[PDB]
Design a protein around this ligand. Structure first.
Ligand SMILES: OC[C@H]1N/C(=N\O)[C@H](O)[C@@H](O)[C@H]1O
Length: 437
């Protein structure tokens, strides 16, 4: 038996562009994911977020599913261009209405909203002005965040500025695999820095606008192990790809040492001028975790080494101890007052059996193991307050399109039927029992 603390927050997570569809409904402006996915060659099968899970229409049903499952918290994101169609200036009341209904419904049903302010769907109008490359985005983002706080901060008390700013900057602007689809290292590092500045401005506005309530930021993380006794290659991957890239500025006022070794010439010349503002106090750290990687020096001077370990449909190695490690490691390095696991989950080739059920034992096994390791971290003093499964629903998985199913609820895209998977049922029992048995 592994029981979690009193009032531990069991959650599920989604993101606006991945689930909503109707990207241009009710006066919404285009996002960069709209234009990126409508550009041939960018997303597998030419898939787009035009329909997705049709949550824009089916939101009440989906929340009733969260309620029926007894899940205590819902992490979801707000589409910036639904709220401010040109990114700044005009506010769209119908966009606010959409999230207002979701928020009120969750509260009526006793479910705690955790709002991700930015989960990657930047207004296209701001991308035309350079998007995350433009220092002025700290202002645009602060203006956007202020609107959300003013409209929803009376009810929503748990906020996340950014989802995975490493991905936004590096996968979006260096690898070019995500919107806005650029390959320029100097742009990517100016995006890193502006994401920090925008995050801090938003926190500053939050303090001025929402007297009660807490704000944090979410990072992607991998568990990197060295191929041999290489150890430095692991050091660099941790500092670059994990929370330190952002938390070293937030807590210590500079980028991590090995990030500066690699990337100093790509940062703005006077980037330290911004660091004291970047240290704006945050209330919690959200860590996302999915996978581990064997890593070797390789003349970024790092390559991955494939291991014969179980993998998900993403090809990601399943390494549950990784979630324990990253929780320990965050406490050891920065000691944030609260931590949440804001995403953990797996993609498998889900099939609806003849019995009408989805027998995803592989996903149950994956979740159980990671929930077990999170439990461990708590016993050793990590202030983990909640854990969010990615995802409530199968959805549009960015450049993979619909080909990767992460839900604990199966979505038949031909009918939009939701079928709760065995993992959703299993999870509901975990939540009801406040832990594993
Ligand atoms: O890959 C599954 C999810 N994992 C994520 N980061 O690792 C993203 O936040 C989320 O939007 C999904 O892409």
């Amino acid at each position: 038996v592994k029981k979690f603390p009193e009032g531990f927050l069991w959650g599920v997570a989604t993101a606006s562009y991945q689930i909503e569809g109707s990207p241009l409904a009710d006066g919404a402006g285009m996002s960069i994911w709209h234009t990126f996915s409508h550009t041939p060659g960018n997303v597998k099968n030419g898939d787009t977020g035009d329909v997705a899970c049709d949550h824009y229409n089916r939101w009440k049903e989906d929340i009733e599913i969260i309620e029926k499952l007894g899940v205590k918290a819902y992490r979801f994101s707000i589409s910036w261009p639904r709220i401010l169609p040109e990114g700044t200036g005009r506010v769209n009341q119908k966009g606010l209405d959409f999230y207002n209904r979701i928020i009120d419904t969750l509260l009526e049903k006793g479910i705690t909203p955790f709002v991700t302010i930015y989960h990657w769907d930047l207004p296209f109008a701001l991308q035309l002005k350079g998007g995350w490359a433009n220092r002025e985005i700290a202002d645009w983002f602060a203006e956007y965040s202020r609107v959300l706080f003013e409209n929803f901060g009376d009810r929503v008390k748990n906020w996340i500025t950014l989802n995975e700013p490493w991905v936004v900057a590096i996968v979006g602007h260096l690898y070019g695999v995500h919107a806005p689809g650029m390959r320029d290292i100097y742009v990517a590092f100016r995006a890193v820095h502006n994401l920090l500045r925008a995050h801090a401005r938003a926190v500053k506005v939050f303090r001025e606008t929402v007297k009660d309530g807490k704000i944090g930021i979410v990072f992607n993380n991998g568990y990197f192990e060295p191929a041999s006794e290489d150890i430095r290659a692991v050091r660099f991957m941790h500092q670059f790809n994990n929370y330190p890239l952002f938390l070293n500025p937030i807590y210590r006022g500079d980028y991590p040492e090995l990030v500066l070794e690699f990337a100093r010439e790509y940062l703005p010349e006077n980037y330290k001028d911004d660091m004291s503002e970047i240290q704006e106090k945050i209330d919690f750290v959200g860590l996302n975790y999915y996978s581990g990687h064997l890593v070797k020096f390789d003349p970024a001077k790092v390559s991955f080494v494939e291991r014969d370990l179980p993998k998900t449909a993403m090809g990601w190695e399943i390494v549950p101890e990784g979630i324990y490690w990253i929780l320990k490691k965050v406490k050891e390095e920065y000691n944030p007052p609260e931590v949440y696991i804001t995403e953990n989950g797996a993609a498998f080739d889900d099939v609806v059996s003849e019995d009408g059920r989805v027998h995803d034992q592989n996903r149950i096994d994956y979740l159980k193991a990671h929930i077990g390791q999170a439990w461990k971290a708590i016993q050793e003093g990590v202030p983990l307050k909640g854990y969010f499964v990615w995802s409530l629903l199968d959805n549009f998985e960015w450049a993979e399109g619909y080909s990767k199913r992460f839900g604990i609820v199966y979505v038949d895209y031909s009918t939009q039927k939701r079928i709760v998977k065995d993992s959703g049922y299993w999870y509901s029992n975990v939540v009801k029992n406040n832990g594993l048995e």
